[PDB]
Amino acid sequence: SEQESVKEFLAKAKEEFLKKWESPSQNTAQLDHFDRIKTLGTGSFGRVMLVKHKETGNHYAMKILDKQKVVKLKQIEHTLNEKRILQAVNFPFLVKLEFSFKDNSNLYMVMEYVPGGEMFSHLRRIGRFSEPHARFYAAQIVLTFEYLHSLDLIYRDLKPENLLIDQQGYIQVTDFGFAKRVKGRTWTLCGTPEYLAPEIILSKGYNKAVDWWALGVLIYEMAAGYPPFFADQPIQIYEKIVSGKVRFPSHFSSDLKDLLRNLLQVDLTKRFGNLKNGVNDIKNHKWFATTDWIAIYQRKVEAPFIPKFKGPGDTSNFDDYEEEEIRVSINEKCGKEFTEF
Ligand SMILES: Clc1ccc(-c2nnc([C@H]3CCNC3)o2)cc1
Ligand SMILES: Clc1ccc(-c2nnc([C@H]3CCNC3)o2)cc1
Ligand SMILES: Clc1ccc(-c2nnc([C@H]3CCNC3)o2)cc1
């Protein structure tokens, strides 16, 4: 079936992941080693801030999570998943975690800063991506899932806001807050409504097939400019998702429609990526006939566009948020819950 070079690559990738997975790094910097520059984005339990390391001058994106808000939102296991996975993975299209640490109030994950901004911004600015442009990004996600799934990891948060565009025009995936190592099935209701597979919505035990469904949603959104299932109320979105009905814009190629019908298959036992040939059904589909998979992996293909930015500390591709304190309490909070962080 697969070439021995590919099998050996993935076998070594798993060996290296498991060594770090079984002995995670902890406490590799502290807050006063950095200067704060700007808030790059916010969220329910945390935010991401551009920082500069005071000794080296290097820029980083620091994700800050409030321990008490994490406990209240029942995200303890998820935050521990995120840091433990990020410190163990290594792949060209994943954001690199450089440091992690905690204090009395917060958990900190310090990643290399990617100045080009989120794919979401670029997609909304241009309207929609041409099929070659969408296919260049989709190929990178296919390889990333091939890697992650071979490590028994499910990603569970694919969407344009989590795909950063780097200085070469390639993707780096960020936010592993829903990622998890899974042996067979898992059961948590999590994700963004527009991207949820039917089996998540229906409260079933599910597997890596949910990532391949989300790839179908992403490719549709890149090529159309909007996602296939949307509405004002989540329950209305869920009803569309489970119905098995998708309408395609007339400008979609026949090959694109065919691939999407096989990724957006409501029956998970019939969905591309989850059949006997696994990822190969996707890589060998006609829509990818022009893709040089090794060249993509090696970053040898010229990108469709390079983001405009002035230097490693430029924030122009991210937007403006109210600047709030990073307060650290005099007393430790939730120490027992986060001992492993
Ligand atoms: Cl997901 C993924 C699966 C397999 C490979 C792979 N198989 N052989 C290689 C060689 C050629 C380039 N340098 C190592 O890479 C890469 C990514
Ligand atoms: Cl409610 C709950 C459900 C599952 C787990 C769990 N699954 N694997 C683990 C590892 C890492 C931390 N300790 C052992 O914990 C913890 C709490
Ligand atoms: Cl390297 C890097 C640079 C920026 C970010 C980032 N900025 N905002 C976010 C959140 C909120 C919206 N989407 C996820 O993440 C993460 C990593």
Ligand 1 pocket: which of 6, 145, 170 to mutate (most atoms within 8 A of CB):
6
Query: What three-state secondary structure class fits 33?
Result: helix
Beta bridge partners of 149: none
- Distance, in Å, from the CA atom of 153 to the CA atom of 208, rounded to the nearest integer, reads 8
The answer to the question of whether 48 is labelled as a binding residue is: yes
Q: Which CATH class name applies to 6-23+118-308?
A: mainly alpha
Q: Which ligand is nearest to the CA of 283?
A: 1
Resolution in A: 1.5
What torsion do the CA atoms of 268, 273, 276, 281 make, to the nearest 10 degrees?
130
- Cα(238)–Cα(197) distance, rounded to whole angstroms? 9
Residue 300 sits at the vertex; the CA angle it makes with 296 and 306, to the nearest 5 degrees, is 90
Using the atom order of ligand 2, give the atom closest to the CA of residue 84: 11
Nearest CA to ligand 2 atom 15: 77
* Cα atoms found within 13 Å of the Cα of residue 65, Cβ hemisphere only: 25
Report the residue count for the chain.
341
Check whether 160 is labelled as a binding-site residue.
Answer: yes
CA of 300, nearest ligand number: 1
Experimental method: X-ray
- What are the residues whose beta carbons fall under 8 Å from the beta carbon of 339, sequence distance 6 or more? none
CA 67 to CA 340: how far, in whole Å? 13
Alpha carbon distances (Å) from 241 to 60, 196, 210? 38, 8, 13
Topology, domain 24-117+309-339: Phosphorylase Kinase; domain 1 (3.30.200)
**77 within ligand 2 shell (Cβ under 6 A):** yes
Which is nearest to 263 in space by CA: 239, 249, 243, 246?
A: 246
Nearest to 50 by CA among 298, 316, 340: 316
SS3 57: coil
Q: Which residues contact 234 (CB under 8 A, 6 or more apart)?
A: 193
Burial (CB < 10 A; 0-12, 13-18, 19+), residue 147, is: buried
Query: What tokens does 334 get?
Result: 């939730």
- Looking at residue 51, its amino acid is V
The set of catalytic residues is 157
**Distance, CA of 215 to CA of 271 (rounded, Å):** 11
The encoded tokens of residue 41 equal 């984005």
294 lines ligand 1 (CB under 6 A): yes
Minimum CA distance residue for ligand 2 atom 13? 340
For residue 36, give the 3-state DSSP assignment.
strand
* Ligand 1, atom 11: closest residue by C-alpha: 294
Measured from the CB, is residue 111 less than 6 Å from ligand 3?
yes
The residue whose CA has the least distance to atom 11 of ligand 3 is 41
Annotated ligand binding at 44? The verdict is yes
Residue 48 beta carbon below 6 angstroms from any ligand 3 atom = yes
List the chain domain ranges: 6-23+118-308, 24-117+309-339
The candidate with the shortest Cα–Cα distance to 210, out of 178, 235, 233, is 178
Read off the DSSP letter of residue 204.
-
How many angstroms does the Cα of residue 211 sit away from the middle of ligand 2? 23
Ligand 1 within 6 A of CB of 146? yes
